[PDB]
Write an enzyme that holds these catalytic residues in place. Structure first.
Site, PDB file in Angstrom:
ATOM      1  N   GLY A  76     -15.669  -7.701  -3.152  1.00  0.00           N
ATOM      2  CA  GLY A  76     -17.068  -7.363  -2.919  1.00  0.00           C
ATOM      3  C   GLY A  76     -17.973  -7.853  -4.023  1.00  0.00           C
ATOM      4  O   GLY A  76     -19.097  -8.301  -3.772  1.00  0.00           O
ATOM      5  N   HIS A  88     -17.744  -9.764   4.449  1.00  0.00           N
ATOM      6  CA  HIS A  88     -18.676  -8.997   3.632  1.00  0.00           C
ATOM      7  C   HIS A  88     -20.071  -9.161   4.169  1.00  0.00           C
ATOM      8  O   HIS A  88     -20.458 -10.259   4.578  1.00  0.00           O
ATOM      9  CB  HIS A  88     -18.660  -9.471   2.184  1.00  0.00           C
ATOM     10  CG  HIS A  88     -17.349  -9.238   1.518  1.00  0.00           C
ATOM     11  ND1 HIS A  88     -17.104  -8.128   0.748  1.00  0.00           N
ATOM     12  CD2 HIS A  88     -16.186  -9.936   1.568  1.00  0.00           C
ATOM     13  CE1 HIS A  88     -15.849  -8.158   0.329  1.00  0.00           C
ATOM     14  NE2 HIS A  88     -15.272  -9.247   0.809  1.00  0.00           N
ATOM     15  N   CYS A 127      -5.240  -9.487  -3.694  1.00  0.00           N
ATOM     16  CA  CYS A 127      -5.731  -8.301  -4.389  1.00  0.00           C
ATOM     17  C   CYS A 127      -6.116  -8.681  -5.811  1.00  0.00           C
ATOM     18  O   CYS A 127      -5.236  -8.877  -6.661  1.00  0.00           O
ATOM     19  CB  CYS A 127      -4.680  -7.195  -4.396  1.00  0.00           C
ATOM     20  SG  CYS A 127      -5.200  -5.744  -5.324  1.00  0.00           S
ATOM     21  N   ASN A 137       0.822  -1.187   0.000  1.00  0.00           N
ATOM     22  CA  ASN A 137       0.000   0.000   0.000  1.00  0.00           C
ATOM     23  C   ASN A 137       0.862   1.245   0.000  1.00  0.00           C
ATOM     24  O   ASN A 137       2.004   1.243   0.472  1.00  0.00           O
ATOM     25  CB  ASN A 137      -0.913   0.020   1.230  1.00  0.00           C
ATOM     26  CG  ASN A 137      -2.001  -0.985   1.142  1.00  0.00           C
ATOM     27  OD1 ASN A 137      -2.784  -0.962   0.212  1.00  0.00           O
ATOM     28  ND2 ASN A 137      -2.022  -1.922   2.071  1.00  0.00           N
TER      29      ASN A 137
END
Lengths: 278, 276
Positions: free
Chosen positions: B222, B161, B75, B66
């Site tokens: 997501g 989630h 990722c 990051n």
């Protein structure tokens, strides 16, 4: 119709520029390109795009045009001149240290110093309220303004765009994000205003944060540093020359007084070299 | 020395990509911080470094960092940029690639249309694994939240989630309810909150409130969670096209225990050179 364009990414105290040499390269950059390249998610990412061109005028060294990331030919904080100067020096397009450049608004005179910083003539300040523009009964060093129940004392100055400057005891705890936007759109600023929060350390040294019109807090608003120095000199808090520390670093402001030009000196840094396809 | 890099994005999640197979450099946290700064650096969401694998039975290794220095474990956007990067820089001629990542070896496939399919692993649906406080595993859970009632699915894709169905994502209360559910006490470790609009069994729109981030425009996990949630509840059937703010993803999932396959774009923005 070139395959690609070479560009340099630069910044002046954290105001970041994509810089293009269109003296040596031939291309017609369309508004479409400015918007594509300006996007920080899907583009190069910049505050402004600076295009260097051949002087379309005699007795001038260069022309430049500045675009914001939304395609408009506006430059609020006036830091691009320093990136331009370091760029034409770094790319060896000139050996001059004193450079005259044709811009949209007129002619900028600048000087590259031995220590690498760039002094830019920012013109004289405009102090009459209606010219700023700002609503007041008469020109004054300071104006009392009521902002949703808070009485503030504000100086109003124009460097070609409107600024209001308020003195704070402590720039780190100043209400930049709360009072900034309230003053930015205050009815007494009919074209809105950049709002500076000025902490005086001694007559030659101050700290400044600026809420930029339409943008919010920025790392280093050159014209805001100019306005704040002018406002502080007029009130006797400051004496020229003033060293102004902004979040992005240090600027030096010179002003000999009413009717005389404000001179701004600061750095400009190369970040990386890039090539983008057309 | 002077390092070559490529700027890429996957659905607007933007990467600085460095080939440290062909280039020799010691990149330290201080460089990641300097380069990641949007004002004074290259500007990126993440730095993706391509390096030699430890196993000769794997094609590459990559590490993702990051802008603030910390290293990322999984990722999905970055995996797709990585794949197109190694192909277009001619580091491989394969279309099916295996790459060592912090979270294990993942299989990537470059499609003829140039999009990349990523094996995202199977979803974890038991509440203890999410983690999500619930009596029993269920297809949806009714949550009492600040005087309101909400129905959400809870899924883990490695991170937690919650997924709510909405009639129109544009009128969904993403900025209001998003942060309320993100930190709801029934999500011990917080959760990414998805707002899912079903167009048809194979097509849906999504917005995501990312935990400790906010609305993110490009949350690939997501999209995986939302498709899984919708398929378990019968509103969707694999394969599902998911329209995020950043663009379109395609999700495939054969059902419980089977991996979710996510397909999306990766785009080259510019080429650069930075002094290290």
């Amino acid at each position: 119709s070139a395959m690609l364009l070479r560009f340099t990414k630069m910044h002046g105290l954290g105001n970041d520029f994509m810089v293009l040499d269109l003296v040596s390269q031939h291309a017609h950059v369309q508004p479409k390109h400015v918007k594509l390249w300006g996007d920080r998610n899907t583009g190069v990412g910049f505050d402004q795009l600076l295009i260097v061109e051949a002087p379309s005028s005699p007795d001038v060294d260069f022309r430049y045009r500045i675009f914001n990331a939304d395609g408009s030919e506006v430059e609020q904080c006036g830091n691009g001149a320093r990136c331009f100067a370091r760029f034409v020096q770094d790319k060896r397009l000139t050996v001059k240290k004193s450079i005259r450049v044709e811009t949209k608004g007129g002619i900028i005179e600048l000087n590259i110093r031995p220590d690498g910083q760039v002094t830019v003539d920012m013109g004289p300040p405009r102090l009459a309220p209606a010219e700023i523009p700002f609503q007041a009964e008469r020109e004054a060093l300071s104006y009392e303004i009521e902002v949703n129940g808070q009485r503030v004392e504000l100086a109003a100055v124009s460097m070609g765009n409107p600024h209001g400057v308020l003195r704070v005891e402590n720039v780190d705890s100043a209400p930049v994000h709360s009072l900034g936007p309230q003053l930015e759109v205050h009815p007494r600023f009919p074209k809105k205003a950049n709002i500076g929060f000025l902490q005086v350390l001694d007559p030659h040294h101050a700290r400044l944060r600026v809420w930029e019109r339409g943008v919010g807090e920025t790392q280093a608003c050159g014209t805001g540093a100019c306005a704040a120095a002018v406002a502080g000199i007029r009130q006797g808090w400051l004496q020229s020359p003033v060293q102004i520390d902004l979040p992005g670093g240090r600027l030096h402001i010179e002003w000999a007084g009413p009717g005389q030009p404000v001179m701004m000196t600061g750095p400009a840094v190369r970040v990386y070299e890039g090539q983008v396809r057309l």
